[model samples]
Target chain A: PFRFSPEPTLEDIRRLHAEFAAERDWEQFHQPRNLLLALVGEVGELAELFQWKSDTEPGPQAWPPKERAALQEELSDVLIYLVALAARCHVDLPQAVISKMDTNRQRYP
Target chain B: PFRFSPEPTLEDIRRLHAEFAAERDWEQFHQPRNLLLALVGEVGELAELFQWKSDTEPGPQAWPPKERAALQEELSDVLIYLVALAARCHVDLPQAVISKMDTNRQRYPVHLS
Candidate 1:
């Protein structure tokens, strides 16, 4: 029973996911390409919701509320799989971001 | 300078991507398909990495640390973009997952797929 504290932190997200994987004992399934595959697959789902729509087709902010809600729900799936992939590889994501953004700064600036 | 505490949570990834976006004034560019576009493109790149390889072509766990390192780096890119999409849209992702799981209970059965 994981708690989200009324306002969950990323740590909370990671821990909840960690416990879920551990509980399921998904060791065999936690390999790279498959985890990465689903991460993108959810993005495909996310795209389907907005496809063929105008660019001005407002999101959660502009609210039909329903579609925006769908976006949120699917995006959550993508993020979870992403973290799982990171976990499988023992990669620390935010640290990776810091490291890369330094290069992004150099490359773009 | 967004700090990750050397360990990042989902929120940290979101914030870092937000700063990166805003710094470059990516406001006009945060539309759903666009964000989702780069995401799929990254995934395509990821898929390309293993397209013709033998299932046991000695990937990742089989050594050749360089390929494993690249895999980690690419997945990091995917995660950052995922968080960026969520951030721009103001989605409560963890909360969303909780709601979906409730429905997912009905969507898939216990049988292995």
Candidate 2:
């Protein structure tokens, strides 16, 4: 079973961001819905990265280094806000994913 | 150090979705850009969920069961496409996260960590 490194699990990211916000005293603005907007904004940025790109390209392996770095950053932004939002909402992301995949199995099977 | 279960790591979800798309022969439609749009659409759906709701509420724990389930489903949708898109683009999401957090630290360091 190939497993991606879980060094930074959902909890790990959540904890990091929780501390980050606390340190900056940004918790007052880190509302669940507000985080959702931040998340969506990052998604838009990700979309912009892919805009006007060739659909036939297999992967970003051929992209220039700077572009690839931007992609990585944007992708990370989406993932970070995602886990953070889940934590704020008290959702267990890992478990929700498992349940969603099970649901997906039935929906697509 | 509390650690979330790694039962479904990025690779795990990538592999599962790879199979799901393969089984349906949806690979052609799963282009990176298209996947990005799908991801964005899901985010829009998530935005709808939060729309017109009070921002003062701390969490969704007060939400009714059905609403909570919808939120979970949407959140999972964003995550699923996220990993799938990363797999397609050959981006290592976990590592990218660590790197970004490193950057975030400099940008928002503790009063003095």
Candidate 3:
């Protein structure tokens, strides 16, 4: 009856993370500050992947399918943290993202 | 001549990741070693969420739903990296998880052992 097959909603992912923590008795550890630090660290790691690759030796276009796929994973990790941090901070991620861009547009204009 | 919905399978997520990479011209940076390091970093971040809270803060049940949802977001991040890592390694995400967990069980002499 509670079928959650195929793709899951953003809300679904949000719910499971909470359940996972609750089931593991890890509520105290879900602080915003700690999550922020971890989020930044992961972003740094994902960035590290392309460090020396900036050389003129080659580019993503010439890379293989696996190569491209790898980037997506890292990128998604960044998104995951971004969303989690935002959620934990009690911020509306989608709304804030839009609002931030709007602010930028106003300033950028 | 095809149709896909909100529920994308592992393969679907994989394809979309690839397309996203192509769109951003980021394939040039999708090396395996780099992605692995990134994945590990995300896992570390996810772990960091449960740090000193190991103390006498009761359990998850005592916590509010908002707190639980916060954990879910970070947890999902790790999964995102995990799936991406498996995909980049040219591994079947589903079968690999099952096979690997089974192997782990055998090591511990538990289920499926």
Give each model's whole-structure lDDT: 0.63, 0.80, 0.47
TM-score to true structure, per model: 0.77, 0.89, 0.44
The CAPRI-style docking tier of model 3 reads: incorrect
Candidate 2 docking class: medium
DockQ of 3: 0.08
Candidate 3 lDDT over residue span A50-106, tens digit each = 566754655543456766555445444444444445456454433333333234334
Candidate 1 lDDT, A41-84, residue by residue in tens: 78788888777677765555575767777876788778777766
**A22-100 per-residue lDDT for model 2 (tens digits):** 7776865368877888898899889888886876764676889999999999999999999888777777777788888
Ranking by DockQ: 2, 1, 3
The alpha-carbon lDDT assigned to residue A39 of candidate 3 equals 57
Q: State the lDDT of candidate 1 residue by residue for B1-113, as single tens digits.
A: 11123355566556666667777746534765677776777667667766666656665545467766666566666766666666666776667766665454456434454
lDDT of 2 by residue, B1-113 (tens): 33356566666777788887787648653678777887888888889888978766545878889989999898988888898888787788888889998898888666755
Q: What share of the true interface contacts does each candidate keep?
A: 0.39, 0.59, 0.03
lDDT score, candidate 1, position B60: 50
Per residue, candidate 3 scores C-alpha lDDT tens digits across B1-113 of 11112244445445655554455436432565555565566556555655656435754334567665555444444444445555664555444333433343355442222
Runs with alpha carbons beyond 4 Å of true place in candidate 1 = A1-15, A18-28, B1-6, B61-63, B101-113
Which number leads on lDDT? Answer: 2
lDDT, residue A38, candidate 2: 85
Candidate 2 positional error at A77, Å? 0.7
Model 3 — interface RMS deviation? 10.4
Pairs of residues clashing in candidate 3: A6-B7, A7-B7, A7-B8, A17-B72, A18-B68, A60-B27, A60-B28
